[PDB]
A paper describes a structure:
We aimed to achieve orally bioavailable molecules that selectively degrade the BAF Chromatin Remodelling complex ATPase [name] over its closely related paralogue SMARCA4, to allow in vivo evaluation of the synthetic lethality concept of [name] dependency in SMARCA4-deficient cancers. Heterobifunctional molecules co-recruit a target protein and an E3 ligase, resulting in ubiquitylation and proteosome-dependent degradation of the target. The synthetic lethality between [name] and SMARCA4, resulting in sensitivity of SMARCA4-deficient cells to loss of [name], has been discovered and validated by genetic methods, but pharmacological validation and exploitation of this synthetic lethal relationship has been hampered by the lack of suitably selective small molecules, in particular for effective in vivo use in animal models. We found that design of linker composition and exit vector placement could be guided and rationalised by ternary co-crystal structures, yielding molecules which exhibit high potency and suitable pharmacokinetic properties to translate to oral in vivo efficacy.
As a first step, we elected to discover an alternative [name] bromodomain binder, incorporating only the absolute minimum of hydrogen bond donors, a high degree of rigidity and distinct and well-defined exit vectors. Incorporating insights of halogen bond optimisation from an alternative benzoxazinone lead series to the quinazoline core led to the design of scaffold compound 1. Next, we hypothesised that placing a basic centre close to Glu1417SMARCA2 could improve the binding affinity and would also balance the solubility of the compound. The attachment of a piperidine was superior to other linear and cyclic basic moieties, such as piperazines or amino-carbocycles, and led us to compound 3 as a purposefully designed [name]/4 BD-binding motif for [name] generation. Overlay of compound 4 and GEN-1 demonstrates the shift in binding mode from a bi-dentate (GEN-1) towards a mono-dentate interaction with Asn1464. Finally, SPR binding kinetics of compound 3 (SPR SMARCA2BD KD = 46 nM) revealed a similar behaviour as previously reported for GEN-1 (SPR SMARCA2BD KD = 206 nM), however with significantly reduced hydrogen bond donor count. , thus offering a superior starting point for the generation of orally bioavailable PROTACs.
Author numbering: 1377 to 1489
Write the structure that this text describes.
């Protein structure tokens, strides 16, 4: 049966909150994470990261009704942030941005659900 309207509305609002988020410096943290690096330019990314995912793919899964619960969506957002932390150095801007986006996802979920 189709996802109920409440679930659909919740996923769009949560992902939009994460993608649109700007820190105290005015920087949109999601920017680098929208699209994966190219397989031709950065093959080492695909050698180390077993399940690559980006926000474009998460938005595709939301659009095509693939997530059946908020937990399903959370699993992919957490995977994206975990991959950023696996590939990139601890303490780097991209590693630290992914930790902030995990927090933004959780806070947005608490406000809509
Ligand atoms: O884990 C990630 N790490 C990175 N990096 C790092 C590799 C090393 C540098 C940062 C990216 C770098 C790019 C360049 C390409 C060429 N033009 C500039 C930007 C593009 C996407 C990148 N990207 C992700 C994109 C989506 C999801 C995840 Br979870 C990641
Ligand atoms: Zn549809
Ligand atoms: Zn794990």
């Amino acid at each position: 049966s189709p996802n109920p309207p409440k679930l659909t509305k919740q996923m769009n609002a949560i992902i939009d909150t994460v993608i649109n988020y700007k820190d105290s410096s005015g920087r949109q943290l999601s920017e680098v994470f929208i699209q994966l690096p190219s397989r031709k330019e950065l093959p080492e990314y695909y050698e180390l990261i077993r399940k690559p995912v980006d926000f474009k793919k998460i938005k595709e899964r939301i659009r095509n009704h693939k997530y059946r619960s908020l937990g399903d969506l959370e699993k992919d957002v957490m995977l994206l942030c975990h991959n950023a932390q696996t590939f990139n150095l601890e303490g780097s801007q991209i590693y630290e941005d992914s930790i902030v986006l995990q927090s933004v996802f959780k806070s947005a979920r608490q406000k809509i659900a």
